[PDB]
Design a protein around this ligand. Structure first.
Ligand code: FE
Ligand code: FE
Lengths: 262, 250, 264, 249, 239, 244
């Protein structure tokens, strides 16, 4: 019902699971659970685990680590070898599941050796997703994180760099470095939400459509900058990032049909 | 002069009333009145009323309802039919006043029926309400915008509706009759434009012409959406979809 | 058929009429009828008439007279008051017919008075066809000309040559001298900013500007000057159509059919 | 002297008496056709305009109308260039086998109308022309582009194709095999882009990726068309529709 | 942790007992001024807002309101920067002589009210910097205190708008400051109007230059009535 | 009266002069006089002069010689030394007079030494030359009409202007500043901007473009900025007012 009741449903499961390990990504979803666990259970009874890996930037790792210390949490860096998994290494469509399976297996073992009763993630509307078990929607997380005074969290969602390569394409340290350096370079010009999709020698840039207007001034520099990172053709996706999201009634449903044809 | 002396006038006035009904919009002023009412009179002696009507979005109503709950108030919405008044429906320059009269009149009936001694609104030192006897206690205690921000800071209020809205009547020329259909279509258009990333927008109604007012510094970004906006607002029932070269409040 | 058979049918028709008044628009077809009238009948047996009215710009009229003088014809301008007809003044969807009816009537008055045996135009609804009602002859249509065959004879004979303001007004809007000037001044200002293909559509206190969409990007630097200029011409609101000049012409398959559906 | 070149050219045509002209609409072939018509008369000159999968109807329709605009008897012919696998496999010598297919059909046309030669607009890799016995009379008379433009002004030609249209195969990487469908896809895409007001456009084919080359100075004008172009080319069968940040070529 | 940082800064204030605070109205001085008020009480804190020609009246009138809003005893003071010959003739050292005039005055105010230190917002005593507050730590503790209102444009000295060697005058400073007030009012918070005698060279971040096209003619006519002959836009942008 | 009348007046005036020297810039006005002169007097009685100087571009000079050749004329280049006059060199509002004096002086001695009866130039509706188009009351409209009638299609469609206009009054021109300005406008023109001015303000470049082209120019900001800096400007800027 009200936010208070959903918050009370949250408190009740925390006090029932005496100790917990928090799977902490830095986003607002995990910021909420990590904060709530601390103030219901205490700094001595909650441990923060921030995964480190080759599929995420050193910046998202560094940022989540500082956010967890500054929430008063005792934080733990943990290091996963996703690219030693042939599904992930070869980016089959089922990569995402084996990568999560490697993930939660690590927290299973880590929670085992710190006395925890469950492993909590931050998923909303055998780990526990109390936000989902308390009927928290997106609107409820923002409100609760507002009333708790939390102000710092990943404003732009982090995503596994697998999303930038086609399926079947094998990921290499050269690949990822190529894609990560190109997205880092774009972000430095003022495009925080950006994807650089990798297509062998074509680099294919997705911007928020609202921003494409402002991007025209950086064409030549982006083109020469990304070429020197090894792309022959630097191109701009005319659909933008999350195409169809802002299309009118008729062209979002058509754009979905094309999205489903692949 | 001190905020302390002004907080005291306001507390004393609430203690004198014992039991109030609050006109709650979600803004900092009505958030400040509602939080002082709850801390002074307790949750059972305070009623938050949120008006729901055709002249404002359901979304904005939903926001005020949840904000009043987040403060720990007993909140009830009341639904007003402003279009029943022929001054409001025919949109004459006095529609503003007959609207407010219908609103304050409804609050008094709620207040009569729950035992409250007054209706409270959020007006500060910066008609129709005075005719109904509503009390503006921030204005009686000489609050300015900065004292509201000061007392909100001291009470730990950090969440209110940063954009107070205005009635959908502002989208229709004087003399234009307001109907349920053209109100909905105007509200849908502005909703669609907000979803594209234009927070400050107006779709002014001119029968078969929609005239879109945007901040001029945002028109450069808008071109990539011309054809989508044009076809979307046509499917909402405007024949021609245009953009005002004068901009927002041209 | 043959172009030879088409010039011959055309030559015979002119020889029969012996003296003609030609309705001269400056278009490729009426340039062809006028120059063929001259070569077959000589300058003394041909009168070119060019119509002037409120519904066309002075620049365009001065052009047609100058195009006809360059052909060596005896050219005459005539001034029509199209707004005298209540179909034209009230801008009904058949107002184009009543315009042509008023013009053919005046040409027929000119032709009677100068001794022409026919009125000629360059052609290839609520009643009789204005031409049949006026006795006008379209000899390129009798000679079965296509745009191609006209195109052959203009270069062949060695020629180089080439909308009513009412289209800026909704059906039913009454047209006045003031508001017609208002539309024409507005479009003239936009053309001077470098926008040759433009429309200023009249919606009482609203001006609605149609541009080719491929130019709307380069128009922004003029937004503010356009808005104050057209407001001083008497519009309260100056707006830009998001569909552009001819909405739906330059869309994809699915959205050009969507825009077509909405117009009905 | 231009008089001496014009005089050699008139003399050559008088001798041939009846000709077939390969007509592109360009300044060079417009001049050959206009000299042929003025020397031999319309009855003795045949204009041929080739239509094929590797060139647009718009270029073909326009050369057909330019040929009538000169007063010529103009005839269209359709070439099936993809019959030759050197053309179909898109090798660097594909233009020779295309050129060879073309002159071969022109010979067949002239045999059947009684012409003594095929004429094209070449002036001072034309091996295919030599193998078929075609004549380039602007080159035989020492015409350069400045003599062509001078005699065109002298004959008062003001209308001809300024755009020298290129074969669609240039939109496919060398070695990528050309099919009827992927040719249509590139032709429909480019036709749609030209119709929006971009005459100089290229859609480079990368299977499921369309890569659009525009002159950079037109990219600002293009912003209003992003969503329509993107959905139009996806409906032509491309998965991704992109714009090259480098511009045209 | 923030609670550890907050402790480091709470204890340091209790040491000093009486403080004088250099108050600019940004989130750093705002966070320092509130903590000082909450740790030492109103009677032991003096907020100084500086008034000069190198900054705007709006920045001065805003900081004075916000410090009172914060519940502090606020005192304006007026520095006369142009009486320094280095400032006036704008030498690449001018920043130093400007800071000498400023902190000298603050020491003069604090010595005369019996404070133990002048405090500022650098992240004089920079207690936020001593407690290792980072930009995120300042945001965290400000929202924790219920603070929502501070000046979100960090002002910059107007001398930067002038070439080295350009004698500042009351007129050219006024001229430049009004030009950026107008541009800021169009929706461009980060802007520089660089002074080149009869030429104005406008610096905008490159991501905003497209959004600016609609204002060219208005900005041109405006800044010319402010005395520039030629109004121009630096193709390089801000910085 | 009629264009056919204006043409005759111009043919009759040409038949009078018999031999003429024609000052040829390569725009539609100049091109039209040279064609009419050639078409009335023939190649042997017409002398096209194209002027080469530091105040105009080599690209425009090579083009005018090409078009005069293309039009069927015996074309003669000549090189003026404008900066050798100190009124021109110090860039005073009197400069136009001394430049026009130096120019027509060279043309008159050319015409005197080839025995023409008059120097002709392209002026339409400064006394050593005859403006036969202006004498026949030709307007820019009459020139286009008679030009297409003759099949003239190729000329300089951007009106060339003397580079001294890019410098403030009183700024002495040098071969270095001129080269600098000329290099800057050559570069901008190569990006797709035929009409541009790069106004010289010592260390500041003020680029003047037609306003309708300023939207299309954003894609070039960084390149123009870097290029014009290697030519010696410290600040490369864009006039908010645009061309003129
Ligand atoms: Fe453009
Ligand atoms: Fe923008």
């Amino acid at each position: 019902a009200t936010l208070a009741t959903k918050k009370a449903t949250l408190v009740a499961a925390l006090k029932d699971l005496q100790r917990v390990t928090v799977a902490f990504s830095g986003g607002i979803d995990s910021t909420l659970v990590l904060k709530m666990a601390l103030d219901v259970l205490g700094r001595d009874n909650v441990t923060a685990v921030v995964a480190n890996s080759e599929l995420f930037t050193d910046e998202e790792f560094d940022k989540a680590m500082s956010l967890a210390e500054e929430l008063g949490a005792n934080v733990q860096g943990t290091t996963l070898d996703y690219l030693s998994d042939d599904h992930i290494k070869n980016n089959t469509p089922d990569s995402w599941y084996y990568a999560k399976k490697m993930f939660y297996s690590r927290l299973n073992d880590i929670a085992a050796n710190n006395g925890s009763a469950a492993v909590l993630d931050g998923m909303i509307k055998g780990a526990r997703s109390l936000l989902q078990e308390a009927d928290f929607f997106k609107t409820d997380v923002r409100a609760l994180a507002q009333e708790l005074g939390l102000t710092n969290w990943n404003k732009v969602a982090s995503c596994s760099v697998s999303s930038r390569f086609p399926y079947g394409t094998t990921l290499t340290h050269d690949n990822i470095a190529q894609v990560m350096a190109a997205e880092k370079y774009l972000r430095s010009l003022g495009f925080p939400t950006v994807r650089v999709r990798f297509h062998n020698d074509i680099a294919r840039i997705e911007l928020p459509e609202a921003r494409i207007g402002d991007f025209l001034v950086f064409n030549d520099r982006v083109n020469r900058q990304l070429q020197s990172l090894g792309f022959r053709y630097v191109t701009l996706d005319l659909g933008g990032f999350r195409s169809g999201r802002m299309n009118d009634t008729l062209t979002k449903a058509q754009l979905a049909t094309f999205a489903a044809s692949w």
